[PDB]
């Protein structure tokens, strides 16, 4: 499987690096998409190479989507192409993993009304206003959508997402 | 004229300091309310003293409210007492100034349905989902609510807010 | 009303941003002059665009001068052209606002003998040795010269400077 | 199964956080041991709670050992008790995972003579002088010892370590 | 000989550490005096232990004085006791070494009128207004006063100061 | 006399700057060699110009060698040319000063068997495994090799090294 990550500068470092390596362990191919080629730097200073830009992503070529948190989702959600990628993959029923501020991209895509999930508690009212049935749990699984809240939930977040990709 | 500020650590420094001094120029008494007494530190490292805690605020004692941005509103909006202060003052028709992420507190208060305003563009979809008629302008004035987007709007933000307090 | 600012990297962020927006509120045109075009960054990391270089400034084209503090004045005062701009505008009786280390430029211009004002207390002995009658006050107004000491004085500093430009 | 981590301040953040969550996914109990109770902070600023001090560790109570990298191993290897824990667990054939500078603790334990493994390439000559058959590979498995070199190897490092704990 | 250093937080790190070790090489005893006991931290993050406070210094007990630069001299020069120590030792003809912003303390002591020396070029006009015959040289020796400008002058600064202490 | 320094980014700032100026005081020519031309930055942010690259160094042209510490030696010791320079100069009996992690380069050169010296205590076991008779002292002098442990030893380190160059 080809797993796409939508992110940008000021991503929450462990929320990108943890699923990146956890999914590589399974033999899945992992791709970082962002605004431009080169590198992006997390809140804590970890640097990662960008594999492709949002403009070059064909959503049909990717099988699963991961949305790390941090401050990057508020930048990503203003890019119409990045939001279109998330709208298409999520609405087609492809596996989507979000954590922390990651689901702000799904709010902007207009795909969460009636869906059950979680997020960083600081944006729960925004998830509720987007029609989410918000749950305070380390991991929520709602069909193709696997959601978690904070870095302390990483173990449970990918435990459930890896099951979805099997 | 007693102006209350609702804020916390990681406030956007100039969005707190600019209205604080602009309103002191007019002879208004300015008060910083936060989670605990002592000091709070902005994103850029400026420190300010907390005058009172959210639990000690009686909203009837304050005439106007300022909501600076940064990452502080996502912490403030999880405090039921801080949200109740903003709900009471805004719903009473008292002057309320918000900028950048500041209106996340008003979203949580449930007072923005059908109101017209702006915010940091990164949360415009959350403002729209809360019932705001969102406008991309340096300053919007909707009755008692004066809203702006980013630090570049400071001059226009307080130019309009000062007129409401006269 | 064209207001010129003489500054450089490591300016005290709020001492530049506060008067910039306060004077824009009045409808005055504000200009940042520095060593080179592009951007300059304050002590706390705020970035601002440089409008023109010291070499391109014709002091006859500007009506008032603002001298923010920080570590920038110690760099600015070594530039003969920047010091000549401050000498000409101050000695012509045009309104000049200084705060914190800002008057180090006026010391270098040789215009403060027998004038009354203030500064960051750490350089009061240097102001006294330049012939200033130094006062420990949040704001001092001596004809065209409006001086303040530290960021806590911002409200009083521009309250008096705005009156001079009216 | 109880997994012990030996670490200190300036640990490489992802080298501690990644195996911590990867092993919690399997249902293993994970324990952070360091010099004192309270918290320790990684090179990149992530902070983690210390579960117990080196003096309180009884090696017989733990089933497996993880040695993250960063600058922490050079501090840990000067603590005779921490080195004795690593010596006892490694020499008893319990699973031991090391990455980056992590095996400096095993060098100090005197247990690597005639063993095959890897490390951060910057200390390969020190591993060779301790009697290691050094291999430049993302992961090496030598009986109970699973070793990796850098953060890019995380996926392979725990892929092999998890197999040892099954 | 007992060499006293007058300094505080935000000292220029190499300007304190270099003379400290260079004078210890000669067998001189070296003492750091500051506002309070404990430690002080330089601009670049080096930490040094404070040996005694300004209040506990008896200038008669010290044979030579060193004044490092950085931002510390602007804090030190506001302390009447620290300025009195520098006034007494300098006016008694004891060896005094200054570099960079270090001579701001001697300006405040009122001992430089007619003396020949140098400093950080950014404060040369303040040295001139204090009556200094200012020279642009890596090191100036004027009787008991050895002065230098910047970190690049360290080699020449202590080359001359060590000769004075022989 | 020409003194060569082998170093890189993340050198311990005072361990490079202190011997650089101490040896310039004696009139010796000092040269910084690193991976590329331009500048290198220490752990604490001091920046120094690189005089020449490792590939351009002819060991016959230099009379003495300095090896500062920090994290730079673990990068330098992976460059076969930099290790060959240290090997050639040390094995020819030219004066060699090392401090802290600096002797990791000599370990990699294979020249320390049966030699007496010291280092940062965190790598003493690696020095012992390289055949060093390790001593816990502020300075050790073994023929041409002058070694010290930490920044607190600077005064003693160059006191002994300067005697070798006379
Ligand atoms: Tb940011
Ligand atoms: Tb934060
Ligand atoms: Tb600076
Ligand atoms: Tb460190
Ligand atoms: Tb052997
Ligand atoms: Tb400072
Ligand atoms: Tb590093
Ligand atoms: Tb042997």
Numbering used by the authors:
A (entry chain B), B (entry chain C), C (entry chain C), D (entry chain A), E (entry chain B), F (entry chain A): 1 to 166
Give the published text.
In this context, we recently proposed a lanthanide-based molecule, named the crystallophore (Tb-Xo4). Tb-Xo4 is a cationic complex with nucleating and phasing properties. In particular, we show that Tb-Xo4 may provide different crystal forms of a single protein and correct the often-encountered defects in crystalline order that may result in low-resolution data as well as twinning. We prove that, beyond these crystallization properties, Tb-Xo4 is one of the most efficient phasing tools compatible with serial crystallography approaches.
We performed two SAD phasings by merging several data sets obtained through the MeshAndCollect approach using protease 1 and pb9. P. horikoshii protease 1 (PhP1) crystallization was performed in sodium malonate pH 5.5. Crystals with dimensions ranging from 10 × 10 × 10 µm to 30 × 30 × 30 µm were used. Data were collected on four different mesh loops corresponding to four different crystallization drops, leading to 81 sub-data sets. Among them 27 were selected and merged by HCA using ccCluster with a distance definition based on the correlation between intensities and with a coefficient linkage threshold value of 0.3 [Fig. 1(a)], resulting in statistics indicated in Table 1. Despite the soaking in the concentrated solution of Tb-Xo4, half of the crystals, coming from four different supports, were sufficiently isomorphous to allow the merging of their respective data sets. For both presented examples, even with soaking of the crystals in a solution containing 100 mM Tb-Xo4, the level of isomorphism between the crystals was sufficiently preserved and kept sufficiently high to derive useful phases.
